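Write out the bound-state structure for A1AC7.
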Amino acid sequence: YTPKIIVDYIVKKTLKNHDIIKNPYPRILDISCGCGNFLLEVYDILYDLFEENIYELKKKYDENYWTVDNIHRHILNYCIYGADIDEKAISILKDSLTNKKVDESDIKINLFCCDSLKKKWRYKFDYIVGNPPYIGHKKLEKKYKKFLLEKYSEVYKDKADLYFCFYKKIIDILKQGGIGSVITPRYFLESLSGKDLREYIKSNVNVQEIVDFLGANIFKNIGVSSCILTFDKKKTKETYIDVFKIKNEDICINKFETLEELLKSSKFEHFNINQRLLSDEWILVNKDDETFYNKIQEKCKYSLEDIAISFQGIITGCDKAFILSKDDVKLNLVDDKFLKCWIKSKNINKYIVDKSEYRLIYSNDIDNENTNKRILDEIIGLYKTKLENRRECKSGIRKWYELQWGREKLFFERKKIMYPYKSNENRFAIDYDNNFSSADVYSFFIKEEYLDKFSYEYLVGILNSSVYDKYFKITAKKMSKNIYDYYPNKVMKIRIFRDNNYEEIENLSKQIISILLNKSIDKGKVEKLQIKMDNLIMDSLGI
DNA sequence: TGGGACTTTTTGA
DNA sequence: TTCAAAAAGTCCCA
Ligand SMILES: Cc1cc(Nc2cc(C[NH+](C)C)cc(NC(=O)c3cccc(Nc4ccnc5ccccc45)c3)c2)nc(N)n1
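---
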């Protein structure tokens, strides 16, 4: 169930400026009403609007039809439309709507118990509101997913979520000049799976306002990051979008009387976006952050993709069969040529990597089972059956004892830069011990021809600075509260520079690394050094 | 006595 | 053949 404040906000957002005199026959649709949270509020608003202008309607239109007693019949016969796939919810909503008046004649309530995606809608609607389903994300049957692919190929493709299709339907059955307002998961704004949906929305309807709650738990005891979308098909010219992005992601929804109070408060920030200038990723930032990003973009000649080679870590397919504690006695059974140092994301800090506490048995270098039978029977064979269920093992590409994705050793066994894929801040570290890692850590190394221009020390100096932390967080995807996704498709697009401040920045980075490396270390001075480096970086970027 | 925070490996391309 | 994106379940403290 949607929170009541959100429902009231959406309903008012649509119907507040409706001219009931000009069009006393509005069609308002709840595609997924459930118990009818939106439709009851729509009924109340419509009843108040009609009673407020009942005598004007009587004077202009038929004098007998427009009476206060007839408002209930008119609303239930011509105005409210609801759809659902649950018959019990439909019956409950019908009973509530009938009891809103409190049997002389028959009142036909326009309620449909059907699949909204597969229904042949007879007419479009002036207003559409509600909350599309999200409980069923990947639980669709094979036939249903095939139908979605065949009939909704423009917004739904493989990894797309169900509610994407709903968006298309809401756009398709919206009357020209009508208004739609829904609360949905916010993931389609930034996820690569929703590029088709974003383009479909941008090229058809005018978006008016986006409420981005980010990681705030809008739905109690439900872990979905929600957003509110309002749009119209009116003949606007400029079509600027109000954006209300939350600031404090730990606020409580119930602690406010209305959503307007929360939006106008300091817990939210507002800025305008030109819809014509939207990219595919829908970067939504204020003017100051936009100027910061543009300055950094124009100042930097190179990007990480231009001067570096990036790769994902080892994917064994069964970590228990190949990862052991360095203290484990079974490592005495494995030749040290097959053992590689193994690190996790927690082992990666700024500028350096913690000492590896684990060893990976790089079984791809085991040639035959006869010579190393002890390794294959006493260590790796413990999970042989599970290792046999891997896709490449079943297809015959990889042997049962080999790593599913062992990548290339020579990529890992070199001086490189490693970073976690999900972190609250920029943590880029120079690896000095040829560490191997799982997919939770990404790595990259400088290209050979750019080694004279860029050094690992300078790269980790600029990347770990607060300047580049802000620069990356501007465009980075926020997967959860206080957690950003650090993936190559975003990390490698970071732009880097080099100028007269290069040598001093590199020296400061070297000092920080040297302090962090020694045993008798106090963090201390490092912070001071960092501050100085940041100054230079700002001096280099004109910020 | 509830209540959400995290890392391994599946899989499309 | 192999990359990399994203999907996917258990568990402990006040
Ligand atoms: C908070 C808390 C907690 C606990 N515990 C535990 C914990 C953990 C970790 N850390 C510490 C937190 C874990 C556990 N398990 C299991 O199985 C595991 C293991 C490993 C890994 C994993 N991963 C996964 C899976 C699936 N899916 C997903 C999704 C997203 C992400 C991730 C993921 C899991 C338990 N307890 C309480 N009380 N609380």
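---
The domain at 4-277 of chain A is CATH 3.40.50.150 (Rossmann fold).
DSSP finds 20 helices and 22 strands in chain A.
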